[PDB]
């Protein structure tokens, strides 16, 4: 690529879950969803990657 200073940020989209609220197979009891712990994450960098 054409010349540019490298600058990178990490994001993970994470989920943590609980089951057995009244049953299994029916559904998850609860899932906690986050982007690096936030509800919103933006890239303000030249480079980025997401897990």
């Amino acid at each position: 690529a054409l010349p540019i200073y490298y600058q990178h940020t990490d994001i993970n989209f994470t989920a943590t879950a609980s089951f057995g609220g009244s049953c299994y197979v029916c559904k998850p009891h609860q899932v906690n969803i986050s982007l690096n712990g936030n509800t919103s994450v933006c890239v303000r960098t030249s480079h980025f990657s997401i897990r």
Partner: protein, 51 residues
């Protein structure tokens, strides 16, 4: 209003006020300042090219 554009080597824009010409050897961060009745609005804009 007056609008002020300037750059610094570190991201702590408050520590310097420069313009690089020609080739660098490090990233430079560039910011915009503008003030409304002491409301010193200040923001990062971007990183300069290598040259």
């Amino acid at each position: 209003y007056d609008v002020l554009f300037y750059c610094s080597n570190s991201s702590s824009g408050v520590l310097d006020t420069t313009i690089p010409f020609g080739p660098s050897s490090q990233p430079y961060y560039c910011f915009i300042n503008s003030t409304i009745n002491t409301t010193h609005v200040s923001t990062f804009v971007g990183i300069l090219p290598p040259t």
